[model samples]
Target: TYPSRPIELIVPYPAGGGTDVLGRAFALASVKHLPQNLIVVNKPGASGAIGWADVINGKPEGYKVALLATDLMTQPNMGLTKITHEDFIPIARLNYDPAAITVRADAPWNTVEEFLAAAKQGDFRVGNGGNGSTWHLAAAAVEDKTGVKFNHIPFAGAAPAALSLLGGHIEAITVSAAEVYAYTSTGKLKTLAVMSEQRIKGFEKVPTLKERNIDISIGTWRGLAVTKGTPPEIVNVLRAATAKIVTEQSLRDALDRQNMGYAYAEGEAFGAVMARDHAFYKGLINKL
Candidate 1:
């Protein structure tokens, strides 16, 4: 009675990035458990506003779903868009990756302290995926925790932001470890610190914001959702399917290969997280 046709899973960012990869993997693993195909469509723009707007306006027939991100909660406060995560029904939270402070490998600053001292003294530009994006907020959180100010630059996505850092267009960038891993590995970029409770596996040498005595821990999280009016039965079906897919060994292997993080919460639990993040960002944005 459900999914009579293919389900369109809208990925608000461009193709080939972390979100697109994870969304595709989820779709691929979820297909065997679902009745119809799960299709991923890229509609990148306005820091994910373009694609999410389509999902928000689509018919509430359960066929049009979206890979929503935590950035959706900060969009309104950043003046990028009026829509927020509250506008849709949350299905499931799939993954979360901690943000990290990175810069060109040849830069003078080698640690967070050196970078912070320089930022406090004068103009230091920091690029991010986009305004109100998770990386942008992470950088802002760092500024709030420390008494440092950075000129925030927003790019279309993480790839462009990392490139900006590589080209010396900006002094630093705040993004997830995976987003800049390739460049970091190639010695083009160096990660100074991560905003996590503990050091990430491969990045054991890098310190966390907490280790530096800054108490901010924030990152990007992705999830699945449909329009608010979609039937409860349909929502539940998607939740169950996603819950199962997220645990599959093949899916876990894919996530590990990409250096993405994993965490799961379904339905109301996921909605609660959105609400909590919305409030957190609201307060944080006011200070920015």
Candidate 2:
């Protein structure tokens, strides 16, 4: 009986953003498995608070769902909204894109070590998506592990921050590899390292922070969710559908074209990730 009508998948960011791109693609790819169409609504604002708040307060019926992101876990601790991961019923985790440390192609520092050494000598401005965004937290995590201080500069989003780096306004930026990969290819930017346990596919030449003896990996993740209290049967339907959609060759090709990462976790495992990161980010936010 669930999803007899079209289901609305609320995307908390504006159209054409990284989240929106993936959300839209997922909607398109999963439509075949779904009984009804998945309608994506853009409700951009407050670093994804506006749309998410709508989803959290929306009817608990399975027809109403939303795309969940790392912001949902950290936003509550920032006092931006009272909503947290516990507010929703996890459906599936779509993917995760690790943060990359990027600098101008011609910058003096050729590696993360050199960058940190220069930071220890003087102020180094590091740009990120926003004050409490995943990029900001990634940069903070790097500082925490490397014992180097950076003058964190918050931008509206990763694109603007990357632009600032190109303009010589900031010394570096910590953004998702996909966000900065184009510039790197154009020979305008150079990635010092990726904050992932292993090297990413496209950026195999770029070492991971772990390889540099820095034991830290942080990134932004995307998932699907509905309001809590939905029937377990409905949740299972979604989980099964998503599991199939993620494995489709067409979807994998689309992800490759977008230069996005791909990983899928069903409801329970996805929920565990949210729970763990929610607690971890709460502690991290207090220090920020």
Candidate 3:
């Protein structure tokens, strides 16, 4: 009787972006796992606040769901929305990528220390996707850690900001290693450091800020969530179905093709991550 109709998988961003693309892949992968179809719907605006708000207030009959991103927490912390992670029940965490400090291959600084040392002098231009974008806060967090003054710049999205770095307009860009992977692999851009706790898989040679005594780790993550009032039985069913697809090679390949790391976490673990992020962003974004 449950899921008698098609289930809606909402992507808060426009179609074709990382989150939207990921949701489409997820729904496609779910085709074999669900009794009914998992259809993807795009509701883009307000940096994902519009779509997320719709899902949060949508009927908790378990048919409507969302592939939420870091904006889940960022929006609330930035005062864009009253809704936070607690508004929805996390079903699973599918992908993750910590931020990275990247510059041209020929930049003077090859390491984060050298970069920060230079930035300590004052006003090194650092670009991010947008003012309240997760990448923006990622750069802000880096400034907070090192007490360096960077002239933060915001581009429409990481692509433009990354382009700025390639064009030598900005000193550096704070984005995910996955985001700059294509350029880095081609030797056009080099990541000085990852904001993660350890070196990422494909970039094993790149060091983390933690090793440099910078105890901060923040990044973008994506996962499924349902309205808070969804029944436990439906939640469990959804979780089990999600687990099946995440283990499928096709789903892993989809994320991997986009350079998104496939790091699966069960609902409980995923909720823990959301809780931590909720607190972290609340503290960081409030200060901004």
lDDT of 3 by residue, 1-288 (tens): 677899998888777877777888888888888899988899988867788888888999998898888777877777777888888898999988999999999999988999999989979899998887778888998888889978999999899999999999999999888889899999999998888867888789988889989877778888999999999999998999998988877788888777788778899998998898788788887777
Q: Best candidate per TM-score, number?
A: 3
TM-score for all models, in order of appearance: 0.74, 0.84, 0.90
Q: Which rank order by TM-score, best down to worst? A: 3, 2, 1
- Lowest lDDT 10-residue stretch of candidate 2: 251-260
**Stretches of candidate 2 exceeding 4 Å from the true structure:** 1-3, 15-18, 167-169, 249-260
Model 2 clash tally, residue pairs:
0
Badly placed stretches (over 4 Å) of model 3 are none
**Candidate 3 vs. true structure, TM-score:** 0.90
lDDT of 3: 0.87
Over 1-288, each residue of candidate 1 has an lDDT whose tens digit, in order, gives 887899999998789987888888888898778999999999888767888889889998888898888768777877778888778998998887889999999999999899998889997999988887688899999888897888999999888999888999999999888788788878889999988768876678999989999987788888889987888998888888887888788777778877788767787888987887788788898876
Ranking by lDDT: 3, 2, 1
